[PDB]
Design a protein around this ligand. Structure first.
Ligand SMILES: Cc1ccccc1CNC(=O)[C@H]1N(C(=O)[C@@H](O)[C@H](Cc2ccccc2)NC(=O)c2cccc(O)c2C)CSC1(C)C
Lengths: 99, 99
């Protein structure tokens, strides 16, 4: 698909058995999702940007489905204002910027 | 061009006659640049990032070149992690996400 940037590029994703709306973010190195239950062990971590930092929990080898494409990678869970799909997963679905 | 996301999508921009490195950020609604001198009057603007909301200075109709592509638009100036090229300018230069 070709997504324009007139509005926020929000897509529907499936993670941990639930559906969520998330933002395709080329500025995010990783993927951070609002509080939810995920399998496996996790490690504390801090991520920061505009406005400062927030603490999140890092879960690895998490499967996610975005627009029909299944990808696997690290997923951070914490008090993010918006669910964000970062580069670590964008690469997996063959997402690129074009102009 | 077509930019992959295995590494941060960093580009060289030109603003105020000076070259600077910036991030093509589809998760940012606006373009935020590190402290510098822009002409004209500015107005207040609050933007919400990963860590919360912050106050920045909004300058309109600012000449800026992105990887050789000339543009003229709104540039926000404030405490940012990196120079962020947001959707307002990404759209102007005809940038889209593809997969
Ligand atoms: C988001 C994330 C996920 C995983 C690991 C680290 C991080 C932290 N990275 C970051 O925060 C990076 N940012 C990003 O990835 C941005 O796309 C960011 C995403 C976002 C959207 C809505 C709520 C909260 C965050 N957007 C904004 O900061 C943003 C949002 C709205 C208007 C605006 O003018 C801006 C600059 C811009 S600064 C940054 C290049 C460091």
């Amino acid at each position: 698909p070709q997504i324009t940037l007139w509005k926020r590029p929000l897509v529907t994703i499936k993670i941990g058995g639930q559906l969520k709306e998330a933002l395709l973010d080329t500025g995010a190195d990783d993927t951070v999702i609002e509080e939810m239950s995920l399998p496996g062990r996790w490690k504390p971590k801090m991520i920061g940007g505009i406005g400062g930092f927030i603490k999140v929990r890092q879960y690895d080898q998490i499967i996610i489905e975005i627009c029909g494409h299944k990808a696997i990678g690290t997923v951070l869970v914490g008090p993010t204002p918006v669910n964000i799909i970062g580069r670590n997963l964008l690469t997996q679905i063959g997402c690129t910027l074009n102009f």
